[PDB]
């Protein structure tokens, strides 16, 4: 629409378990604070998965915490044009009609 | 193992660190506890022990003790920082019973995660005869 | 707050005393695993002669 500039933007929402999801809400199974919120990134290591699995005792308080992230995109528009010009004699006295 | 807990009033950060270790940030010592509990090993984690230790101390000055209305019982603001060595867990366990015939090779494999590197392994063997005790295998 | 602990592996639940123990600690499916009979190949070849 008009009166909105020359740009369009949109959000993209990242899943929970990707590497792009970076935040500080993490709490590991022991209850201590941890750097990364997501349980594990796009990592297929069995050792890392075993280390970072969410495990629960009978009483689970403040054990495993997660977070989320979103991304934005954009695009813009431009203007183009060209022209040409002539005279009346060039049209009247030319050999063939239909030049226009 | 025995763990030692220190509390910083201004930043509301509780530090869990070994018995020998110490901190000069300005925190105070609240108490100690065994991370693998003697009676309930797989029942309680570090969070429960820290909460139980903090229940005793006073809100105004964590140096002194207080009754119920005046403790530190809000664990949402408190952050737990871990500096002690991670507990030693058994990722892979030996099969309970192995059956074989005479003249065949047998193999035992064990995997241990956590702890403080490096790790040392020792194997022991107890004879099937009556009145036998574990003896080291000659390395 | 596992006052249940694990009755197997030697741990004791809190309600149970030092002497007693849980009566039942597992489930038994009562469906057994069996293996099939080995197949025979040389037997169909033989031709029988009466004695």
Swiss-Prot record, chain A:
It is found in: Virion. It comes from the Viruses. Assembles, to form an icosahedral capsid with a T=9 symmetry, about 60 nm in diameter, and consisting of 535 capsid proteins. This is Major capsid protein. The chain holds residues 52 to 151 of 401 of the full protein.
